[PDB]
Amino acid sequence: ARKALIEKAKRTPKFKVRAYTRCVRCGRARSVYRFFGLCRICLRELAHKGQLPGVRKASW
C-alpha cells in the first residue's frame, strides 16, 4: 500500500472530492504544499540545495 496508492491519487477515474494531495518525490499525503507539490521534508533538503530558486533561510 504505497505504490498502488500513489497510482490511485493519479488516475482520478472517479468522483471529485476523492482526489487529494500527494508529494512528487516521495509520495507523502500529509504536510504536502501545493506551491511546490512537495512534502515538508524533501522541501527542506532541496531548499538547502538551492534547487528551489528565490528561496533562502529566512530570519528576523
Binding site: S31, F35, G54, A58
Partner: protein
C-alpha cells in the same frame, strides 16, 4: 503611455537590469521616470525541522518576489528598437502596458 513591470526573485539582478533600461531609453529618447521599488510580495514557509515527532525547533525560509517600476512617456522609435535587442535578462519578469 508605455509602462514596464519587473517582478523577480534575485533582487541583485533585478536592480542592475532595472538600471540598464533607464540607461538606454533615457539617453536616446523621451523622458523616463526613475525606477520605483514596489512593495515586495513575500511567501514564508515554516516547516518541522525533523522528519518525525519534534514539533519545535522547526526551520523556516522565505520566497521574496521583488517589484521594480519604470515608465517611458513618449514611444520614440529610437528607443523602441534598441530596447528590443539590447536587453538580456535571466530570471526577470518584464511586462508592458499602454
Amino acid at each position: 503611455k508605455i509602462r514596464i513591470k519587473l517582478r523577480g526573485f534575485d533582487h541583485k539582478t533585478l536592480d542592475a537590469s532595472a538600471q540598464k533600461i533607464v540607461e538606454a531609453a533615457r539617453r536616446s529618447g523621451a523622458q523616463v521616470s526613475g525606477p520605483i521599488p514596489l512593495p515586495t510580495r513575500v511567501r514564508r514557509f515554516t516547516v518541522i525541522r525533523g522528519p518525525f515527532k519534534h514539533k519545535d525547533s522547526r526551520e523556516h525560509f522565505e520566497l521574496r518576489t521583488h517589484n521594480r517600476l519604470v515608465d517611458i512617456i513618449n514611444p520614440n522609435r529610437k528607443t523602441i528598437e534598441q530596447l528590443m535587442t539590447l536587453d538580456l535578462p535571466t530570471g526577470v519578469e518584464i511586462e508592458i502596458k499602454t
